């Protein structure tokens, strides 16, 4: 005769009904990503539509559940997630603007165009067309055209579409009793109902900004250092007194600076840590690449992979007619079914991606005992940062010499670590200001205190201040270059990548202290330590059933999002960068110098 026993009956009914429907949709989506036919797109959408419509019926039934008397916390978190109305609050004339706009945005992003205006020779897709002009060439004139080949040919048609998108997605928050749509994405980090453990939605803006005043002095010296080794390819085209152009930062958007490693190597005379040539001497294949990753995990203490994955998943590119994309993604089909979807290669990245993409799988069966609504990560940053802590460990020279990939006689001097640490700094430190700035811009435009004519003059003036990028060409408000990125166009919360770095290094210091490694964090290893495996597995198995702030106290002992155990990873790099920047102009103000 209590609502508490009535909710446990309903959640027990929903868990068995949803996991049957979710497995059919996940199995249909797996076949779409392996064997593309004309009917397979309709076949996946048929099962995926009835799964989305199933949640519409269950959300209305759980609404009549009053929350003010449920003392149990396991079902309180389940009822809060199940009762999210989402698109049910909108009218029929307004709900049709979601699926129409989002599929037009995705189709627009799928159009690859590098054909020159008034010179129509040929142009390929994004991966074969756009990536070669950004990762290999060192010419300023065509890269400026290539910067304008996508930000003036794809983003020009999004202004009437994306501004209409940010005025109706913003209205759901008042209908869902949220502040704005930027506040809606912070509900994943929101914790309520526990005394002293509560995480407010508005304190997260402050905590991200509070951790940024020590990221900045690392990024101040990184940007100062990288501007002296960039003017070698462009002598008279950039001044070493201001900021950097946007089309010279590794990517089209400057998210990852991995392609600047070849241009800005400190001391390239001694050979780098490269074992791509080592695997082709020993005849490595797709099976042996993932087999050494599996024995790496069981040496830590995690359970090994099941027998229904090696003979069931695909590893290479199969056949000739199957033109399916094999971007490295982790699949959680449920009911004990776990798959990895990627194309294997004997390279540095694919060997690390083999370790990286398995970690999301190793996180997925950990909360397999949890109910279906709690069968997820603690937040959006846990499931990405867990899959990357083994990528830091697998790239260490100690782990590479353990298997036998590296040479048995490889000395470890100063520069053998600065070359490795600076490669990690361009892909980790360089993406923190880009991730924070874009989410700060998206949060305020979702708040609504940014007029229509002030998108670019505020977006560009903060890119110049925080990130430190001079615009290669001035742009008015009709340009829409911030919407060109993959995550912003497909409705992905990008704040999960800023907290990914701050999580993947909080766990690294906790696991290295558990393994009792004598040395710095760059040479540390996780394998051959069952004490570190048991420390990680206790927090992986919790899932969303416990608050994420309780997951931190199980590994690091700090209930807040700690940023201190990330500067300690780059202290060998940071102390050298402070000595290298004795005469360079470190620290930029606002700089309209090059393109006034």
């Amino acid at each position: 005769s209590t609502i508490e026993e009535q909710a446990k009956t309903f959640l027990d009914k929903f868990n068995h009904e949803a996991e049957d429907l979710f497995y059919q949709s996940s199995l249909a989506s797996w076949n779409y990503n392996t064997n593309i036919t004309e009917e397979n797109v309709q076949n996946m959408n048929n099962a995926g539509d009835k799964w989305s419509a199933f949640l519409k019926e269950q959300s209305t039934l759980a609404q009549m559940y009053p929350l003010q008397e449920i003392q149990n916390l396991t079902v309180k978190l389940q009822l809060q997630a199940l009762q999210q109305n989402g698109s049910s609050v909108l009218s029929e004339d307004k709900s049709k603007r979601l699926n129409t706009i989002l599929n037009t945005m995705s189709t627009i992003y799928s159009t690859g165009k590098v054909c020159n205006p008034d010179n129509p020779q040929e142009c390929l897709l994004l991966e074969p067309g756009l990536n070669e002009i950004m990762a290999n060439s060192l010419d300023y004139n065509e890269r400026l055209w290539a910067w304008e080949s996508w930000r003036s040919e794809v983003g020009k048609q999004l202004r009437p579409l994306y501004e209409e998108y940010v005025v109706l997605k913003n209205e759901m928050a008042r209908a869902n009793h949220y502040e704005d749509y930027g506040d809606y994405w912070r509900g994943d980090y929101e914790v309520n109902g526990v005394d002293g453990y509560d995480y407010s939605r508005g304190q997260l803006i402050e905590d991200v900004e509070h951790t940024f005043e020590e990221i900045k002095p690392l990024y101040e010296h990184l940007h100062a250092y990288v501007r002296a080794k960039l003017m070698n390819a462009y002598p008279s085209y950039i001044s070493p007194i201001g900021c950097l152009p946007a089309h010279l930062l590794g990517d089209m958007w400057g998210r990852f600076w991995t392609n600047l490693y070849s241009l800005t190597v400190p001391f390239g005379q001694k050979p780098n840590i490269d074992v791509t040539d080592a695997m082709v001497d020993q005849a490595w294949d797709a099976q042996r690449i993932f087999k050494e990753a599996e024995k790496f995990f069981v040496s830590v203490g995690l359970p090994n992979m099941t027998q229904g994955f090696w003979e069931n998943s695909m590893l290479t590119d199969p056949g000739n007619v199957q033109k399916a994309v094999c971007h490295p993604t982790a699949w959680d089909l449920g009911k004990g079914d776990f798959r990895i979807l990627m194309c294997t290669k004997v390279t540095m990245d694919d060997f690390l991606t083999a370790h990286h993409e398995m970690g999301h799988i190793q996180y997925d069966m950990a909360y397999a005992a949890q109910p279906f609504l709690l069968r997820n990560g603690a937040n959006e940053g846990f499931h990405e940062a867990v899959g990357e802590i083994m990528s830091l460990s697998a790239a260490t020279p100690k782990h590479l010499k353990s298997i036998g990939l590296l040479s048995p006689d490889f000395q470890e001097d100063n520069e053998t670590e600065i070359n490795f640490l600076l490669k990690q700094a361009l892909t980790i430190v360089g993406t923190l200001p880009f991730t924070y700035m874009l989410e700060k811009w998206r949060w305020m435009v979702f708040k609504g205190e940014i007029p229509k004519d002030q998108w670019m003059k505020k977006w560009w003036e903060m890119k110049r201040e925080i990130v430190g990028v001079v615009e290669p060409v001035p742009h008015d408000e009709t340009y829409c270059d911030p919407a060109s990125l993959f995550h912003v166009s497909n409705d992905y919360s990008f704040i999960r990548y800023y907290t990914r770095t701050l999580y993947q290094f909080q766990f690294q210091e906790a696991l290295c202290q558990a393994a009792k490694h004598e040395g710095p964090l760059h040479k540390c290893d996780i394998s051959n330590s069952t004490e570190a495996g048991q420390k990680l597995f206790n927090m992986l198995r919790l899932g969303k059933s416990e608050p994420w702030t309780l997951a931190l106290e199980n590994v690091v002992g700090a209930k807040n999002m700690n940023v201190r155990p990330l500067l300690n990873y780059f202290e060998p790099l940071f102390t050298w960068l402070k000595d290298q920047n004795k005469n360079s102009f470190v620290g930029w103000s606002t700089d309209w110098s090059p393109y006034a």
């Binding site: 026993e5 009535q6 009956t9 009914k13 009904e17 049957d20 497995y23 099941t306 009911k335 004990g336």
Partner: protein
């Protein structure tokens, strides 16, 4: 049948060969509770009722005496001190289909715990709240019946394992059927211990000229001294005498 419709059929008047199970090389949960696999062959108990049902891989551990849970509490409860064995094996090749095997159902909610060795067949709906349900699903009806989903691609954890339960209890009924005690190597003209069904002794085994009727097991001549046995595996009558002895 389903877990909530487990059958109960008596096994009697026949020999149950438990040796073939040991060398099957396909079992995964061949465990015995309250008895040993080796010592249930020489001696046996009546009431060999066998229960047939399908239990998922994750819920195999729930099916054990002295252990509670969901299946053991609302579907089929094993009584404490259950002197029997549990035998299970995988049935993925046959007890599975694409799209979900919607042929096995189970009870998810019950007002009271199931009495051990009770089979319940009813359409009564659960009463989570106070307001009665009049057959129309509402906020407190919660139709407990649900269909399991088994697929060939399902993980080993939830793989549908074919499991059978054998019970062995010694009630007031004697003269029951036991397991296999195949044979030893018979020896003739040598002082050898013999223990047939109901009698034992020592002596010399040799051929006999006398004839026994087809409804006896042994015989005696004088002063209740056994001197001839007719073993049933050979259908032959033999003569038994104590082996040579005397005072030197």
């Amino acid at each position: 049948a389903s877990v909530y419709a487990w059958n109960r059929k008596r096994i009697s008047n026949c020999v149950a060969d438990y040796s073939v199970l040991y060398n099957s090389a396909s079992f995964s949960t061949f465990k015995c509770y309250g008895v040993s696999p080796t010592k249930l062959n020489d001696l046996c108990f009546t009431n060999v009722y066998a229960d047939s049902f399908v239990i998922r891989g994750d819920e195999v551990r729930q099916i054990a005496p002295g252990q509670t849970g969901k299946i053991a509490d609302y579907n089929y409860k094993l009584p404490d001190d259950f002197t029997g064995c549990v035998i299970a094996w995988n049935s993925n090749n046959l007890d599975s289909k694409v799209g979900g095997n919607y042929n096995y159902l189970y009870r998810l909610f019950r007002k009271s715990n199931l009495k051990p060795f009770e089979r319940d067949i009813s359409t009564e709906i659960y009463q989570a709240g106070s307001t009665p349900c009049n057959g129309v699903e509402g906020f407190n009806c919660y139709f407990p019946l649900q269909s399991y989903g088994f697929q060939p691609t399902n993980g080993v954890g939830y793989q549908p394992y074919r499991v059978v339960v054998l019970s062995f209890e010694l009630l007031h009924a004697p003269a029951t059927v036991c397991g296999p005690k195949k044979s030893t190597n018979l020896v003739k003209n040598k002082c050898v211990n013999f223990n047939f069904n109901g009698l034992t002794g020592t002596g010399v085994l040799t051929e006999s000229n006398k004839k026994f009727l087809p409804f006896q097991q042994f015989g005696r001549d004088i002063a209740d001294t056994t001197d001839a046995v007719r073993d049933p595996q050979t259908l032959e009558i033999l003569d038994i005498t104590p082996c040579s002895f005397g005072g030197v």
